[PDB]
Structure formats: structure tokens, C-alpha cells
Amino acid sequence: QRCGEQGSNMECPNNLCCSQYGYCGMGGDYCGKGCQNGACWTSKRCGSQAGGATCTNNQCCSQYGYCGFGAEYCGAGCQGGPCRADIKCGSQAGGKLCPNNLCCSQWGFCGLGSEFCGGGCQSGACSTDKPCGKDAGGRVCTNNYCCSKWGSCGIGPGYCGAGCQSGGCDG
Amino acid sequence: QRCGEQGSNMECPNNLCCSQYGYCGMGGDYCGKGCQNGACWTSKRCGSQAGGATCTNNQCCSQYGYCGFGAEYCGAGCQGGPCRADIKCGSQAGGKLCPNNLCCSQWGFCGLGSEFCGGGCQSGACSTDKPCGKDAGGRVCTNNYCCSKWGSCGIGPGYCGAGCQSGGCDG
Ligand SMILES: CC(=O)N[C@H]1[C@H]([C@H](O)[C@H](O)CO)O[C@@](O[C@H]2[C@@H](O)[C@@H](CO)O[C@@H](O[C@H]3[C@H](O)[C@@H](O)[C@H](O)O[C@@H]3CO)[C@@H]2O)(C(=O)O)C[C@@H]1O
Ligand SMILES: CC(=O)N[C@H]1[C@H]([C@H](O)[C@H](O)CO)O[C@@](O[C@H]2[C@@H](O)[C@@H](CO)O[C@@H](O[C@H]3[C@H](O)[C@@H](O)[C@H](O)O[C@@H]3CO)[C@@H]2O)(C(=O)O)C[C@@H]1O
């Protein structure tokens, strides 16, 4: 029930702003100074301009390296987020990984839903629960996900914990 | 450090999925059944098709009323989220309110950043801290925000609590 650093980076809903304290609301108290996510009065820096950084709340990183929504951010030159132009990926775009766990469709585009996450899904939050492990002819997940002791790709204690065969195994 | 119903609707970061229990991770345990937000294997229903409902994680509500990202969702017929076409608002579009607290620019478009939230901002997470109250010639905030005892628009205990002049005052 806590956001930002004090909520393991949880994010408020409806772009509610997360104050410097880890509470959600709207207004200067939250959106003003120390804001850590949501609709912070001061756009956070992103993209090139800010060491490869991604925006929170699924924001489009404008060409200038500022986070937001609207033509200016999502529009031309956009560098991350639900960018107005199809973000490419997969074996089509040299192994490229969708940002923010998005699915790399069979076709080489980034998204979320059956069309992207479904059959053919190359990387990201594929819903095709494909197997890994000794169990899966020594195949490692994508996104450096954890191959749990049952040969399943995911992120968490059950996945990254004990019996973790490969991926980002808690060490 | 808890999501969904057990985290006052906090949302995991990077589209991490929130399990039926209120924990964040990636995989079937979280993305499978009971998923409450993030990249849930099963798209949540939205728009018309689902009583005016908005998608979580700033997702585009496709023409069919399913939440996601990518051309299919964000593209033509899109009904909410960082839709690929400019969502209109403000006095230009009959008082329309941007969804998900987005700013209604001076021009009548929805977004987030200086360009939308800045000078002229009509409604939403305007960063122009305009005043309300007896203090402000009996002017009420937009979005049914709370006019605190100091004549400030916001959402929270300090705003919606005691001394709340108008808005969604905790009652
Ligand atoms: C769409 C987008 O990214 N909007 C940004 C813009 C853009 O970066 C910009 O419009 C592209 O030209 O900038 C905003 O921040 C700028 C603003 O604070 C202005 C002054 O108010 O300065 C810009 O940078 C200056 C900086 O202030 C100086 O200290 C420095 O000496 O020069 C810099 C030259 O760029 C800020 O980037 C804006 O409000 O216009 C923020 C939007 O999110
Ligand atoms: C972009 C988008 O919204 N993608 C959805 C699609 C679309 O709703 C669709 O492609 C537009 O035609 O549908 C997805 O769900 C559908 C899928 O489960 C199929 C069958 O696997 O059925 C569709 O609805 C059926 C429903 O299953 C039947 O019980 C009912 O008798 O008829 C319905 C007629 O539409 C689902 O909508 C999909 O996976 O294709 C989900 C995507 O998010």
C-alpha cells in the first residue's frame, strides 16, 4: 500500500503521483518535489539523454529524453513506451528485446495481448508458458528470466529461488 | 510492497503481473489465473464492452474492448490509453475529461508533460497549482478533486480530509 522506493517501486493507478514518502495522491504534496512516479510535475528524464533509462507508468520517452503522453512524447522521434510507431524486435531486429516486458510478436513488433503474447511470441511476457531446463533440452528463457526447478520461465522467489536452473537466479 | 486489491491497486513496474494474492512477478503463477494487473495472460475487458472501464498500466483499450499495446490495441478504433490518435478534451470537446488524470492542454488534447500540464492546462494533473475555495472566489477543482483547507486541488487525506471545501471530500 506504499509506492516508489518504499513499495518496491509499485506504481499508483490512474497516474496518481507517488510522493517522496511512498504515498499516492494528486497535488503538489505528491506531484511536486520528490515525486517518484505517476504524473510528476517535473517529467523524469529518459532514453539516451538519461543512460538508457525507461519511463515509469508506461510513458513514451520523447526525442529529447523526457517522459509523458501526447503527440510531443509519443509522436515522432519517440524512444520508448507505447510509441506511436511500431517498435520492432525479435530475430527480425537482431534479437532486440521489447522494453518493459512487452511481447515480441511472431512478426517482430512489440505489444501486449494475444496477438503479441500468443503463439509465435519471441520474448517478453509471452503467455505460451514454454519450458526450459534439463527438462527442456537445456534451453534458457529470454529476458534473463528464471528457469525454476520445474522448468518454467518467470520472475519471483519461486522462480529465481532454490532449484533455479538458469536466468536471474537469486544468488 | 503489495499489489492489486491488497496494495490499494498499486501496479507492478515493467508490466510485472500482480497475482491473485497481491505479489509481483512474471510467469504463470502471476500472469496466469487471478492476475489483477500488469501483463495478465488474459487481457482484461475495457471500454464500452465493459461498462466504461479503463485499462490498468496505461493500456490502450482496443476497439473490441480488450487491453494491450501494439497496433491492434493502440491503433484505429482504440478507445482509451495512449491511443495513437490524439484524444480530444476540454471546452473544445464539450468539457470532456482526459482519462486516467491526463492533462487537457490549452488546445484540447490529452497528455502528460509541460506541454499538456503546463500553462493553459484545462483539467487533469495540471502542474499549475491553481487555487480553489472561499479563497478562490468559490471555484471548485476539476476531476472532482478535493479543495483542501488551504485552497489547493489534490487527492489524499490532507486534501480530501478535514477542512475540505469541495471536491471528493472524505465524508
Ligand atoms: C516534448 C518534450 O520533451 N518536452 C520537454 C521540453 C523539450 O526538451 C523541448 O521543448 C525541446 O526543445 O522541454 C521542457 O523542459 C525544458 C525547459 O525547462 C526549458 C526552460 O524552461 O529548458 C530546457 O532545457 C534548457 C535548460 O532549462 C537550461 O538550464 C539549459 O541551459 O539549456 C537547456 C536547453 O534545452 C528544458 O529541457 C519544457 O518545459 O519545455 C520539458 C518538456 O518535458
Ligand atoms: C485486438 C483485440 O482486441 N484482440 C482480442 C481479440 C479480438 O476481440 C478479436 O480478434 C476481434 O475479432 O480476441 C481475443 O479473444 C477472442 C478469442 O478468445 C476467441 C476465441 O479464441 O473468441 C473471441 O470471442 C468469442 C468467444 O470466444 C466465444 O465464447 C463467443 O461465442 O464468441 C466470441 C466472438 O467474438 C474472443 O474475443 C483473441 O485471442 O483473439 C483476445 C484479443 O485480446
Swiss-Prot record, chains A, B:
Disulfide bonds: C3-C18, C12-C24, C17-C31, C35-C40, C46-C61, C55-C67, C60-C74, C78-C83, C89-C104, C98-C110, C103-C117, C121-C126, C132-C147, C141-C153, C146-C160, C164-C169
Role, per record: N-acetyl-D-glucosamine / N-acetyl-D-neuraminic acid binding lectin.
Entire-sequence positions represented here: 28 to 197 of 212
Segments forming domain Chitin-binding type-1: 2-42, 43-85, 86-128, 129-171
Name of the protein: Agglutinin isolectin 1
Quaternary structure, from the entry: Homodimer, u-shaped.
Annotated binding of substrate, by residue: 10-12, 62-73, 114-115
Organism: Triticum aestivum
Superkingdom, taxonomy of origin: Eukaryota
More about this protein: The 4 sites proposed for binding to carbohydrates (N-acetyl-D-glucosamine) of receptor molecules are on the surface of the agglutinin molecule.
GO molecular-function term, one example from the UniProt record: carbohydrate binding
Keyword field: Chitin-binding, Disulfide bond, Lectin, Pyrrolidone carboxylic acid, Repeat, Signal
